[model samples]
Target chain A: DRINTVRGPITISEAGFTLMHEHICGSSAGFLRAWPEFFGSRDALAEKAVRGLRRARAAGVRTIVDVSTFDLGRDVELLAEVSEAADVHIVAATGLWFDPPLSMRLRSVEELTQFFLREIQYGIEDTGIRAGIIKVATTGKATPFQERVLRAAARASLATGVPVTTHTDASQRDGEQQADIFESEGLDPSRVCIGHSDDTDDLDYLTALAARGYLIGLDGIPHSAIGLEDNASAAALLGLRSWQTRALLIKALIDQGYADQILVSNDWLFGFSSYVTNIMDVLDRVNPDGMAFIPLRVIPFLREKGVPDETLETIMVDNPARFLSPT
Target chain B: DRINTVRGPITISEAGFTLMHEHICGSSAGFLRAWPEFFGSRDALAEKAVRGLRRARAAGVRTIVDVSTFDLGRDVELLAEVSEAADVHIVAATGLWFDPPLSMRLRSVEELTQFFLREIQYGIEDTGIRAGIIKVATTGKATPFQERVLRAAARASLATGVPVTTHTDASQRDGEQQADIFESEGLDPSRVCIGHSDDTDDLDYLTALAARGYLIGLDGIPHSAIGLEDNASAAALLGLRSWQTRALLIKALIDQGYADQILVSNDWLFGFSSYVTNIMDVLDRVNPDGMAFIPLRVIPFLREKGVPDETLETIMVDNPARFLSPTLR
Candidate 1:
């Protein structure tokens, strides 16, 4: 069966120019639950997301994978509306983000497994829109709790045949550790996509992960809004290279004949509170196209770097289909 | 009256060669409460902390501020035991850390304020040991809840006269926002030490915070055991400047005549769990004298870079005395 989207599952062929990692709205679930006004009017924010997605669709994007987990403000009903309004398909994620909230922390791995399975099978919070992929994130180092959540995700994916995608700190080689856990859990490595691999240019690390038959996510491609130059002091001081370097890394990986193993996207988001809205303002000032940067800038940059059109198609289309398709 | 140490208050003059920031222990309170075995024997961990503090005292440290908050596993009775065992006055902190627990999350600012006040006034969890400092922390960005805690810390500090210290992402310039809130709450900026300023080499940012009369904590000194090479990816990529850069930043501030507004220490800890013990083992191998690095290495490095003895005295002794003095002033 094809992966479930907000509009319902469609064949792999229909998932076109897919932006593998994106977010429609992200906020604190506790804060939202406690003080709904903390985020301002919901309708206005959802309208902004609808407009942004419509633009993304116009820019040749057919599907968007909204990887904002439960704690990071994953709203499926709103996602369904935006998907319908923008004429796009959004695959909502069913997994925890970096750390499980304090309440979720004490639950047994078995309990969490059941929680994740319920969402994947029955759909999230009774929205009837089943999550297509499992999303789990790890920080610089994995805490015991984080490891537990990853193991739970592994079990859920095993039971439900849904693919597991992850957020990792490339510098720590957490992808290696994550793969170890998934593999230990008897889940096929092929069902996992180790995320944020583009944050580092370590070819050895990238290849080592890919060698294990796991897909490496080169997501978080730069929009002019968020880049090495336009980031926090630590990011600028660390000499984090730009999206151009990310493109170069992608091309290098393809040259080494791992085109089928790469998935690329901007990790773009729409409504992320004033902090992100302020950052997005810079995006508006510089790259008015925003999400369109991938199809508009990155694709051309990759082609300019001698990446064949078929290779780009394979990354944007076929790789996402295979990675998200049922195991 | 002097700052309240776990043992008792000692006059400001007695707070000597003070390491402004160090931890005898740090762990997850939730994890400890959930799975106590997660950290190993409490007595064994306490003994390790005592040994570490004894070494720190032997290396010429007189007073050490244990900044571990309740959420970060601040054990008052254990701190008291380590303080008594090591023959050092350890000042305990009373405030929340990065994020609140599930229970604390649902609390109001007034409720949190009362909780912190009870700790400062009465004692923490029925242990008769009062907190010496109000500790609060913020992530890369200050969330609404984090701001609430800061405001509560301000309220409690104002009521108790125990000075405030903070854990901040210097890269995000959170120290400025912290100062803004504390200042708005009418707590003198001088009573607040905007911590981890050494994380950034941005002298302009550091000096701006210092210019507001807030003490800048260049507390994370060089410890070879924990560096980007040995650390997780986040630490590695942040280009956590070497201890030498921290020394140079201190020397530069002293050159600009901000010596009285600076505090220095290693932010070192002794009895962290396996999560940290494994990392601590790396430190034990490289710089076995972990807490001694600041006094043994950083001091000499700064002196070689043309820093005078008087400047070192001000940072190590005079500044902390002034920073922690009772609010009778």
Candidate 2:
């Protein structure tokens, strides 16, 4: 019945209306570490974050799992502030993302595993805020470096009893490969969430991963900003699908009786800076509603597509609660 | 000295101002095989293809390498018609693309290699339009099946003395992997052109392939149709760079004294149909000029980037000329 929030421990039932994958504020760790001035003031950034989160909370999102890992600018202190100010439970993650710094990259998998274990067992950097999940990502083909981090995340998850989430390239269909590594290491498939799966619409691929007993993340809801034409060659070449085709395949899986195995989220990150000063600025122009996109737009779209309210409740509430709980 | 073309054999010297990788018309062979009615009139499609080629020829393109393979609707007969209509020497390819049918997929590498060699030596399907080059492709990661095809292509290239070209996911840097396979098969890397290397700006990755003596393809110019924001995530996730960034890499490589090891093209496929009936219909809306983009826009952009005429000549003409020449290379 145990679950961890930014405000500390809570019962699993209280983790209601949870957005399983999101970021309240995703700043750059390299920039913050090298030159904090790039982010301007933390106070102002947090204020902007609180406004976004409060709006999301008003839309019935009571909890958010911030999957921004250590390298992609996971700031626990700022997350705590935003969670308190907005009154939404925030769950932080521990693990390295794609292309970590040289220091972490040079370390062994066992060494990386130990480091992740420390963050989850104790807390992330003495803030007394424990990481509730582990996030690992792979590049296009899952090179040795990426595989090392993924295996380390798997070991850490097994040790800490925290669920393992992933960032995958749906084109490469590397989720099954990730599952293979975890299962070979004695980690249960049920404990893994194959993420960013909404990026592709290959039902055979999605169903295969779900049949292996892992939670297939049909995240990236309301992916209207990305078009199908851009990925046409990719679809032909790599069997990669796009956001434009997500709904049909998602519905197809639900029809195939994998409803309990599906998890949905926007995978939206706020305050994320791009090659420009701010990437969120551009995303805001297209998806101005921020984290409320799932609750506001995607839910209605699903309803119109004939996805029952019961399935919506399962994806938004029940599945997340079970995934986050320590049974 | 024999450079095979749809118009018959020509000397490498006669292969002038070549656009290295292009498709005059791309049709789905599987669809045409399953349901021929989907394509409508072959004559009308060939006519449309001729018009595109003529316009490209007017822009100074003399020869084009049609890398469309059999599965992606490689029509040697149709290609011969378009080449005569447009009066351009169109080089046909004799290798497999990314996905082959299950029947071809089940064959051993030796079996596939023999099929490619027969096309190169005799001709594709007895049309007497001999294949000038071999084309092989891989997904993001080279799946075992793709690797099998790549190795077979390498074997065919070695056996027939025809050069090998490739399709790769630039973000995944699969070109290097393709190079590794060719090298392992004892095929000289100089005989290979790694297509789509322009999709990324990582000089280290591009230079590594160039260092192996392989020609790097900086195709897909004026990628205005694909939005910048979409490619941004692809860059972060897939390591996909922009056409804007490709200029910098091409400049960097020339500065690094690898000008002769570079090739350029539009990667344009005119009259290409897809599941949605006509893929080119949408592409025309975004990139109307098609094959004309390289000579029309990219050359001027490179000129503005301070690339000298000699280097432009090397990329557009001299390099492709060398790659195509069986003896000179």
Candidate 3:
């Protein structure tokens, strides 16, 4: 009844594979604000994005849930075009992005509800591009913005049976807080992915969220992309070992019997100037001898720690697919 | 000529060799609590007062200013007994410590002033121990109680020309705020050694206080008795590096061009058990393989960075002497 296309709304049986998170296009607003002297052309950035996606595909990536929401340069049309060109499933979102300059100013609750309901009911039905997943975000510290967005997203997800995921800030408490909101809003707790949950040393916070049957986003694998988001700034400020935190989180998620709820992505957006796209400044800039701190280097770290390839696939693919479709 | 010990008062020709801050004895109460667990012996700690004259003989550490006042476990009898045992010139003091709970019922303003004047003049004339420094403390943040304590110390330091030194809370901005209080009190800002100045990562804070002409205590360095105190608990604690922190603070103090304004001591309480004789934890554990942070590891770091030896000596001794003297402030 449906045709599978590279530009999202891919045809699937009751069980289908999908990436709960993948970036199609985004810009370094914060990065540009920080380093205004630096700039690059769109064509140049698109070329790099193409290269990065090719790398991801070579490593077994198929579909991507593009959580790079509207305000931070979410290019849905470009994302669709890029998905078609790159031969990967690209599912874009429609939602009010997280707080601060990008946060939305809804005229009323009815308007906000309509916005979410429309995305859920009509995204794939009207445009043939399925609303694969619902996107939501929290303020750096679980502010009222987080509560409002999650509530709307949960309501839409419960109605449409689309899975919900979030963008958390600073630490994993926001993830837990988001899950609490979803549970309270009567959404299936398992159908939610926690995003940007790597920016903390507190493992208990993350595993507890996983124990609540929510997926954890180990999406912050290091990339040569700009650190334009507050999440990126907080990551840099904290100077966490991306691989270390991700691996530890995944291991804990598995140990806590939530291996079926772990997801990984680069959270990379190459649509920025070459200045911000350099890897050295983002990953290999620790005090002494700079070393690479990314997921490629970390996958082996997991393998050495005896995390099976099947487990990896389950985390990065099967579990993510479970969120995008139903069995 | 007055018979003297290193921390005791020596009547030298009045070029004002003010021991701006010198402890006559360790904090008796806190020392007793941390003694058996940290410092190795109590008898050796008690013997330190008796052995003071030998250290005084090696250096012109005369007119030793003791600022240990009430509320910090300053045992006046111990100070007097130590003075009697050693020929080290000692200047005993009368001043207040910081508050709120520190001074639940201390003397009032007039009573305190009279008490301080009595100690200053009477010590110079009647008692075997003299009075030279006014000691005080603050809890990093400014408070009404801290201000009252400083006002009392400043009044005593100015009235007697003895100079003042203050304890600052290790966890907060006690040093900087206390300096502000001192300037407001019209006290000679130089005569103030802002204690616990080495507790923060903030170099600007240390430089700011030093720019105002105050001495700094590189005290509390010997928590290296980690093995004796709570080794298992320290290892159990998830992420803390007390040794590294102390090393960094020592090196930073050395680097901030305030080496001459720096003084190093264990804040040792000999009367306590662990520290009775272990005054030099840096010497004991802060070497290359041991504490890689600084002062110990900094020896190589500074040598590599080309800090001269003479500059190092000033940090070790000469600066400490000037820091103690009344005139430098």
Candidate 4:
């Protein structure tokens, strides 16, 4: 099985120790314009991101699925730069955020599907940096407009045989709503990863989705959901969460024989458009190992919980490689 | 003010006794093939249709706004022939019935607007019979695909300044739902007539729609909704409805000073794709005056209910002329 990447295609086995959902950057230009000395140029940010990915590389994290869309001003060229500099594979995505412009909303679902198909078939921006996955999202519920984008995402994934990753309001059980649409479009549950599943302790919802053959993205690891810390006097930026809540959920799933259906990631971005904080400094402030937060911190905790080495390998590796591989 | 009729432009005054919503035919070819002898050729039915419109003409129905679409295989050429022969104005519509194909569903709202605009601006087919009114419909509920068609109808109506008429399942309050979409697209409520409104006796709903400045279609009269009578031994084919129910609804609206918002029509079709009955014989058999059923039966009942002739003129003539004209065209 092959997977298209920002660098090109690599066989499924080469996608070892994959972080299934993460953003390399939201807007490269927004970050460079804000931090001139720390990151004055594109390659400069690329070097910093490469260092973060390199640190994760020590834990055998070989690939990152970059689920940033054009809505977030994703820079595929810079993604290729970071992938090369760190010797890591980055899978860029093609789909929309929930709130697109009225012009985009007015296009037919077929035209929207064709627009996504163009990127995966040819490439993004004529750079031949092909996207490997489809990404669409919903907040609480979908309006009429967002429904079309979701359908387009499903169609593109079905056409290209790439998996679809989504950002959903898990508390709303938005995964079921999204699954309803994808299932209607003839997309099987295995071709999708329901992101942000760990945001809520809805074990039944997560298990039901996994039981129906979906990959559960317990992607919001650490404080991504429990709440990130504030200023230095206030708290450490990378303060650890009460891992018992999520870790217990993981234990329950593993006990329920769904160990092969989990794909854990930090849902972290190396850098982004925020002017207030340098993203890497904050992550390094407490130093949770950036993208390897789950591998280094969470995996050690899982082993202590009596999770076998093979189940850890399935959650961190085999699940992602199989889910991300082209059918 | 000029109104586009199949016979070409007619003044607003010439649009007298307008039946604002009616289906002249559903499928001309199907009916033509089925009733080839009782209506041997297109002209044969057109000749009989001339008589029906001529009878409707006697009760003072000068124009019939034909609301059928290509979905029903609406024939504009046959409409022109009936208009010429009966000397009645038939305003054809450009839009879809509720159940359009998947191919139409996939087109963008803009492309759907272009398809409707072509018929209104240029003509239907090569016959150059320009459609005057835009027609789009909803049943009890609308699918996402129907929403696009409704938006296209609103846009085409807005662009051409032509009025939009719709077949709404008034029981579901579909008029309000259709109004929501049309109003969202920047169409004023005045430019639309909510069809099949009298299908229910929900006076407050009708009053609310009328209060919002929309034309109310008291269209499903004379048992169109209250169950048309079955075979002759059972009841009259053109059986008169218990006029008190609908007439009281009418009297209530007129009493509330909304006579100007009313558009009464039979919603009856002259001929369609049926083989069992000759439409004219069944209609002429009971003879509730066909398209003039309201004027011939319900109006006289309304008169006894002490409704003034002036209000009658407003509901039949003044409202239809005011609403159907192209932004006072």
Question: How close is every model to the real structure, measured as TM-score?
Answer: 0.53, 0.49, 0.43, 0.48
Write down the lDDT of every candidate, Cα atoms only.
0.77, 0.75, 0.53, 0.75
- For candidate 1, the per-residue lDDT at A122 reads 79
Docking class of 1: incorrect
Per-candidate clashes, comma-separated: 0, 0, 27, 2
Worst 10 residues of 1 chain B by lDDT: B30-39
Tens-digit lDDT track of model 2 for A80-158: 8889999999988988777354335545787678767866877775477788999988746777877788888888878
Query: How is the predicted docking of candidate 3 categorized under the CAPRI scheme?
Result: incorrect
Q: What DockQ would you assign to candidate 2?
A: 0.01
Tens-digit lDDT track of model 3 for A153-225: 7777767777777777745377766777788888877778888776565777877777777778876655322
Q: After superposition, how far is residue A155 of candidate 2 from its true place, in Å?
A: 53
Write model 2 residue lDDT over B21-99, tens digit each, in one string.
8886655332222222334556676777788889989998999999987656677878898999999899999787864
The collision pairs in model 1 are none
What TM-score does the predicted chain A of each candidate obtain versus native chain A? 0.92, 0.91, 0.78, 0.89
What lDDT tens digits, residue by residue, belong to model 1 across residues B1-329? 66889998798888898998888766644233323333355667777778888888888888999888766767677788888998988898888886454445545677678767877787766567888888899867788888889899888888878889999888899998999999898999888998988888899998898888889998886643234464663354234456677678998898777898999988877655424225556555555676777888888888888888888988999999888885722
lDDT (Cα, tens digit) per residue for candidate 4, span A1-327: 789999889998999899998988654211122122333455676776888898888878999999887555467877888889889899998887653432244556886787688778877754777788888999888877678888998899889898888888887999999999999999999999989887778889999999999988888666431344545421432233555566667778889989888888877776654223354555555446778787888888889989999999988889988898888
Candidate 1 lDDT tens digits, A138-224: 876778778888899999999988989999888888898999888989989889999988887799988988988999898877732
Which lDDT tens digits does candidate 3 get at residues B208-288?
A: 877777777655443443444444432332113354565466567667777767664434322321122333433334222
